[PDB]
Design an enzyme around this catalytic site. Structure first.
Site, mmCIF file in Angstrom:
data_model
loop_
_atom_site.group_PDB
_atom_site.id
_atom_site.type_symbol
_atom_site.label_atom_id
_atom_site.label_comp_id
_atom_site.label_asym_id
_atom_site.label_seq_id
_atom_site.Cartn_x
_atom_site.Cartn_y
_atom_site.Cartn_z
ATOM 1 N N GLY A 63 22.563 -1.791 20.277
ATOM 2 C CA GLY A 63 21.244 -1.731 19.725
ATOM 3 C C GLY A 63 21.170 -2.317 18.041
ATOM 4 N N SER A 85 18.637 -8.318 22.594
ATOM 5 C CA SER A 85 17.525 -8.419 21.314
ATOM 6 C C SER A 85 17.875 -9.048 20.344
ATOM 7 C CB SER A 85 17.241 -6.900 21.116
ATOM 8 O OG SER A 85 16.387 -6.891 20.025
ATOM 9 N N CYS A 258 11.497 13.058 32.138
ATOM 10 C CA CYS A 258 12.556 13.258 32.172
ATOM 11 C C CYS A 258 13.180 14.672 31.672
ATOM 12 C CB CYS A 258 13.287 12.179 31.185
ATOM 13 S SG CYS A 258 13.314 10.372 31.583
HETATM 14 N N1 LIG Z 1 23.804 -6.518 30.605
HETATM 15 C C1 LIG Z 1 23.759 -6.192 29.155
HETATM 16 N N2 LIG Z 1 24.908 -6.611 28.323
HETATM 17 C C2 LIG Z 1 24.981 -5.830 26.957
HETATM 18 N N3 LIG Z 1 23.684 -5.293 26.644
HETATM 19 C C3 LIG Z 1 22.716 -4.770 27.457
HETATM 20 C C4 LIG Z 1 22.756 -5.467 28.849
HETATM 21 N N4 LIG Z 1 21.792 -4.925 29.283
HETATM 22 C C5 LIG Z 1 21.179 -4.190 28.577
HETATM 23 N N5 LIG Z 1 21.807 -4.028 27.607
HETATM 24 C C6 LIG Z 1 21.473 -3.457 26.056
HETATM 25 O O1 LIG Z 1 21.872 -2.134 26.413
HETATM 26 C C7 LIG Z 1 21.206 -1.457 25.107
HETATM 27 C C8 LIG Z 1 20.693 -0.033 25.655
HETATM 28 S S1 LIG Z 1 19.628 0.939 24.756
HETATM 29 C C9 LIG Z 1 20.806 1.781 23.971
HETATM 30 C C10 LIG Z 1 21.316 1.030 22.412
HETATM 31 C C11 LIG Z 1 22.629 2.056 21.732
HETATM 32 N N6 LIG Z 1 24.035 1.682 22.545
HETATM 33 C C12 LIG Z 1 22.023 3.512 21.553
HETATM 34 O O2 LIG Z 1 22.724 4.430 21.846
HETATM 35 O O3 LIG Z 1 20.839 3.486 20.751
HETATM 36 C C13 LIG Z 1 20.078 -2.543 24.587
HETATM 37 O O4 LIG Z 1 20.623 -3.112 23.486
HETATM 38 C C14 LIG Z 1 20.041 -3.608 25.756
HETATM 39 O O5 LIG Z 1 19.457 -4.718 25.314
#
Ligand SMILES: Nc1ncnc2c1ncn2[C@@H]1O[C@H](CSCC[C@H](N)C(=O)O)[C@@H](O)[C@H]1O
Length: 281
Positions: A63, A85, A258
């Site tokens: 993130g 992202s 949720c």
């Molecule tokens: N196949 C993949 N490989 C790497 N990141 C991925 C992914 N699929 C989804 N994500 C990423 O996983 C994250 C989940 S949201 C949570 C983000 C952070 N670790 C926190 O706790 O706030 C987002 O960055 C999304 O883009």
């Protein structure tokens, strides 16, 4: 056309804490603010990882980069983060670039599927439910293979139960929960899929990992979702202005839904630890 359900960073800023953490917080002590509690969840994860100065840690789904910063600051480790992202990526470089450290720091715009470089330790907090069941063998294999003999990984993920387990709780509740889960996985995280804890454990094990008993975070996600819901609610009008009333009600139903199903023990959230055979005792 999966991008119909894409929401802007602006919207998320109107329910999340300042760190922009989009995952279960850890209220321990229970009197922590959400923001404090998000740092606490980060520590909870990292402290499991046997991180030593000069290791490289991998954050799969990094993130806004809060985990990686806290890691380099607390453990004097190199970091690499994977995010899908473009905005998160730019933010992350800025965040990392500011740290007073000689440690290497790096963030890539890509999935784990495309990452195959040697790292010491791995953290993944709530990216897992984006992956899809079909990809689990390849995920734990990739993670096992890129780590040294003493490697460790945590994966924190929301979790559902097998349709068999849910029937025990009564059919009315079991079909209702199934529909809510379809909703999450369709409109909130399109293409997502909730694993069960048992899947997280057994896939890890099939890859060669030792897996202690996962830690349930359920009451903490109850509190997190309460504050997320209450915050969006109090920002109803700005939210609508930045998006639609549609988008707003969509997220109110997510957060309140949720919270409800977690309260009803129909959802869980597991922090699972995976230890390679050579992991330190
Ligand atoms: N196949 C993949 N490989 C790497 N990141 C991925 C992914 N699929 C989804 N994500 C990423 O996983 C994250 C989940 S949201 C949570 C983000 C952070 N670790 C926190 O706790 O706030 C987002 O960055 C999304 O883009």
């Amino acid at each position: 056309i999966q991008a119909h359900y894409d929401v802007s960073d602006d919207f998320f800023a109107l329910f999340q804490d300042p760190t922009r953490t989009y995952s279960c917080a850890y209220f321990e002590p229970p009197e922590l603010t959400l923001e404090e509690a998000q740092y606490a969840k980060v520590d909870l994860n990292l402290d499991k990882l046997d991180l030593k100065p000069g290791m490289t840690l991998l954050d799969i789904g990094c993130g806004w980069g809060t985990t990686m910063r806290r890691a380099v600051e607390r453990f004097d480790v190199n970091v690499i983060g994977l995010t899908l992202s473009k905005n998160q990526h730019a933010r992350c470089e800025q965040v990392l670039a500011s740290i007073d450290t000689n440690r290497s720091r790096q963030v890539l715009l890509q999935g784990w599927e495309d990452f195959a470089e040697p790292v010491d330790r791995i953290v993944s907090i709530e990216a897992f439910e984006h992956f899809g069941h079909e990809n689990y063998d390849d995920f734990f294999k990739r993670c096992f293979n890129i780590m040294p003999a003493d490697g460790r990984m945590t994966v924190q993920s929301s979790v559902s139960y097998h349709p068999y387990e849910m029937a025990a709780r009564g059919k009315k509740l079991s079909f209702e929960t199934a529909r809510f889960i379809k909703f999450i996985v369709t409109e909130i995280f399109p293409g997502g899929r909730l694993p069960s804890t048992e899947m997280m454990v057994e896939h890890g094990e099939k890859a060669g990992f030792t897996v202690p008993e996962p830690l349930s975070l359920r009451p903490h996600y109850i509190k997190t979702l309460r504050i997320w819901g209450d915050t969006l609610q109090s920002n109803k009008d700005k939210a609508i202005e930045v998006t639609s009333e549609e988008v707003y009600n969509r997220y109110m139903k997510y957060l309140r839904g949720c919270e409800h199903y977690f309260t009803d023990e129909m959802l869980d959230c597991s922090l699972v630890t995976y230890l390679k055979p050579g992991a330190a005792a």
